[PDB]
Design a protein around this nucleic acid. Structure first.
Ligand SMILES: Nc1nc2c(ncn2[C@@H]2O[C@H](COP(=O)(O)OP(=O)(O)CP(=O)(O)O)[C@@H](O)[C@H]2O)c(=O)[nH]1
Ligand SMILES: [Mg+2]
Length: 203
RNA sequence: GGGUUCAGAACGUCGUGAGACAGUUCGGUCUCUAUCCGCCACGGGCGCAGGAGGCUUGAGGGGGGCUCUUCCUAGUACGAG
């Protein structure tokens, strides 16, 4: 009652970094629910069990790199979910020392923060060729052209440590909402619900 | 009436002694009846510029005024955390 792994598509490890409280984990649980419906072989994880360690849970934050499995009819992924803060950097650095690609995560409301830097810096010294940004917390105050300033300065940061910043695919949206509807929408593909389609732009 | 503050008894101690010490130590009677002012209640009498059965206004008095936890705004202002 464990089942044999059926290697169909190719496997690639992608991790998720970025400062604290910026949606790193939820965005992670999201990719689980999102990519779920449109294909089996995923096994759903939630904001709760993604961070099953007491305190990590009861206390609020993420303390240990997760490790999630979700695919696409295109490519199979293994998602290593790093923690924000400092202190635990010794656990993100270990999560990072793996992941082929890093799904960077910045927040519209806050913008690139102190850890956002170092993480990127570690990625340039860990050996994570390729980064993808994902502005989260966008569903905040109508910023006609403010969230645009983020993608202007975040790219400045990436192209500040030898990263294709100007090329880096900066998706936009919210993970909470995206998650939320999915949370109460198990089965349901893309090209339908608002935000859910914002996750796929990233996937 | 547990402490002190009578009489008994003892310790230490001081005194030849009787005795002595806010030094200890055990014991050791706390008084049915409220006249007046005061107070809580309750009436009788006369008064209210005509006699009565009812229902009332409220000057002025009194009473009562308290506080904690948790959830939501929101893990949002602020904060590297
Ligand atoms: N407004 C808004 N809030 C969101 C969004 N995504 C997440 N959040 C908020 O952040 C909370 C937890 O975020 P989480 O994903 O764990 O943050 P994190 O990136 O893991 C921070 P660390 O890993 O360092 O502990 C959520 O319960 C929610 O209130 C979003 O897209 N918009
Ligand atoms: Mg986390």
């Amino acid at each position: 009652a464990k089942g044999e792994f059926i290697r169909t598509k190719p496997h690639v490890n992608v991790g998720t970094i970025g400062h604290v409280d910026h949606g790193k984990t939820t965005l992670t649980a999201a990719l689980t629910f999102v990519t779920a419906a449109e294909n089996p072989n995923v096994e759903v994880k939630d904001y709760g069990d993604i961070d099953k360690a007491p305190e990590e849970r009861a206390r609020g934050i993420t303390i240990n790199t997760a490790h999630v499995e979700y695919e696409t009819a295109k490519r199979h992924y293994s998602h290593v979910d790093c923690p924000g803060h400092a202190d635990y950097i010794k656990n993100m650095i270990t999560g990072a020392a793996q992941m082929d690609g890093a799904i960077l995560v910045v927040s519209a409301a806050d913008g690139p923060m102190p850890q956002t830097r170092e993480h990127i810096l570690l990625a340039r010294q860990v050996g994570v060729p390729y980064i993808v940004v994902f502005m989260n917390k966008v569903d905040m105050v109508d910023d006609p052209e403010l969230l645009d300033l983020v993608e202007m300065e975040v790219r400045d940061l990436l192209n500040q440590y030898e990263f294709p910043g100007d090329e880096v695919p900066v998706i936009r949206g919210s993970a909470l909402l995206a998650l939320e509807q999915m949370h109460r929408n198990p089965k349901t593909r893309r090209g339908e619900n608002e935000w859910v389609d914002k996750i796929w732009e990233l996937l």
